[PDB]
């Protein structure tokens, strides 16, 4: 039902990446697996595909000599390795599962296969700048952040590299009124972002608020208590 991809990472120019695609709540069976990339603010680009049941693979002409597409049958994990990494290889790497069951395939009849299930994507950043975990600071609710009624409180995720950083509240239980803002890039080359949550003003002395900051490139998770 889902395609669980490996975490975002920085990778040095000239190095190689291996992105994992794990199927959860379902197995590869006889469906195709495809790697599709998207550079920030750019289109989708097909890289290569495999039918894990057969071990039969293909890659785009532009990647043929740098991409290695593989798959493990049982476990149900597919891999895409891309070598000689360059700044132009910075992109979100998606894995996707086809709709067609290739056990019923007849080679004289092309199938109506399409990219039915997609992974969330892993952002590979190709840079010679090294990884940095974030510094997480609480953004306390005060009378200057109150609107009635409701009250705004948040977390400041300062000086991290590379992107992304995800933020949830109360271990995912608090989803209503959450606004995680896109990061700013400082002149230092480090990023910072903020996450806010609009809660009822009356619950400020009775409800605990913790923002859960995930920085997968540094394998950091900061659970920051936001008190009044």
């Amino acid at each position: 039902v889902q395609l669980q991809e490996s975490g975002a990472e920085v990778k040095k120019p000239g190095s190689s990446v291996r992105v994992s695609c794990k199927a959860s709540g379902g197995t590869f069976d006889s469906y195709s697996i495809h790697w599709v990339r998207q550079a920030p603010g750019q289109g989708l680009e097909w890289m290569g595909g495999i039918i894990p049941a057969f071990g039969t693979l293909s890659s785009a002409q532009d990647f043929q000599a740098r991409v290695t597409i593989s798959a493990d049958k049982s476990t149900s994990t597919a891999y895409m390795e891309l070598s000689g990494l360059r700044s132009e290889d910075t992109a979100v790497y998606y894995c996707a599962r086809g709709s067609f069951d290739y056990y019923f395939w007849s080679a004289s009849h092309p199938p109506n296969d399409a990219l039915a299930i997609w992974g969330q994507g892993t952002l590979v950043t190709v840079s010679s700048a090294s990884t940095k975990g974030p510094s997480v600071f609480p953004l306390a609710p005060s009378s200057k952040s109150t609107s009635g009624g409701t009250a705004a409180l948040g977390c400041l995720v300062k000086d991290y590299f590379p992107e992304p950083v995800t933020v949830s509240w109360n271990s995912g239980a608090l989803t209503s009124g959450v606004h995680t803002f896109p990061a700013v890039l400082q002149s230092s080359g480090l990023y910072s972002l903020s996450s806010v949550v609009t809660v009822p003003s009356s619950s400020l002395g009775t409800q605990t608020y913790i923002c859960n900051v995930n920085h997968k490139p540094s394998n950091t998770k900061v659970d920051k208590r936001v008190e009044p």
């Binding site: 495809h34 599709v36 289109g43 989708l44 680009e45 097909w46 595909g49 293909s58 785009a60 002409q61 998606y94 996707a96 709709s99 092309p110 109506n112 296969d113 399409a114 990219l115 039915a116 997609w118 992974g119 969330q120 994507g121 510094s135 600071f137 609480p138 953004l139 306390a140 200057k144 952040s145 705004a152 948040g154 400041l156 300062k158 606004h179 803002f181 896109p182 990061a183 700013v184 890039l185 400082q186 002149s187 910072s192 972002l193 903020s194 806010v196």
Partner: protein, 210 residues
């Protein structure tokens, strides 16, 4: 390359049409599928087998093919249809996949919205690490363009200010954030600091004091 128009626009409730132009070797001899990508989301399958729809996909989306050219159509164009749309093919002969350039769908006549502004002062924990950041968060504005100016008391501060580009939210409104980097000393030296947000000639100003 499979060509798509970069931008397509229509008002709420009418019909929009997305073209996918190719050649015989790509679109011509093979099946075209359609993909939708909302901002920040992974692509989603809308149309497969030139015209068929997967489960959950509303009937407002339809697909067609005429040789080297394919078309996606949207009827009763909603606010939630504002996304990026791609056509994709599989070259059966060569065993290769190909996506068109992608089209951005913009919905016309969206009402103007005043920005919602929240300003946060430095946290005492940040101040203890001998650094200070003022956090100005801007949300629910339309059109997606604001101007941010910061002030120390009432004097203009240009240095140590980092503002993002405006970003589209899930409610088709826009958001942006501006940060003012200070030393704890400068923060305490002044009696106040302001973040002024201008949008459509009107300003929403917030203040924080030590």
């Amino acid at each position: 390359v499979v060509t798509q128009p970069p931008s397509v626009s229509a008002a709420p409730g009418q019909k929009v049409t997305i073209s996918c132009s190719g050649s015989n070797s790509d679109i011509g001899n093979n099946y075209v599928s359609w993909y939708q990508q909302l901002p920040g989301t992974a692509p989603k399958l809308l149309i497969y087998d030139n015209n068929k729809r997967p489960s959950g996909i509303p009937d407002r989306f339809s697909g067609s093919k005429s040789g080297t050219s394919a078309t996606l159509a949207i009827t009763g164009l909603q606010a939630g249809d504002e996304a990026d749309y791609y056509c994709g093919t599989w070259l059966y002969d060569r065993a290769v996949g190909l996506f068109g350039g992608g089209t951005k769908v913009t919905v016309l006549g969206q009402p103007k919205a005043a920005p919602s502004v929240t300003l946060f002062p430095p946290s005492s924990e940040e101040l203890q690490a001998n650094k200070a950041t003022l956090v100005c968060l801007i949300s629910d504005f339309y059109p997606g363009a604001v101007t941010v100016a910061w002030k120390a008391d009432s004097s203009p501060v240009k240095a140590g200010v980092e503002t993002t580009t405006p970003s589209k939210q899930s409610n088709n409104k826009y958001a942006a954030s501006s940060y003012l980097s200070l030393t704890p000393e400068q923060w305490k030296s002044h009696r106040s600091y302001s973040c002024q947000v201008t949008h459509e000639g009107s300003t929403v100003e917030k203040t924080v004091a030590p």
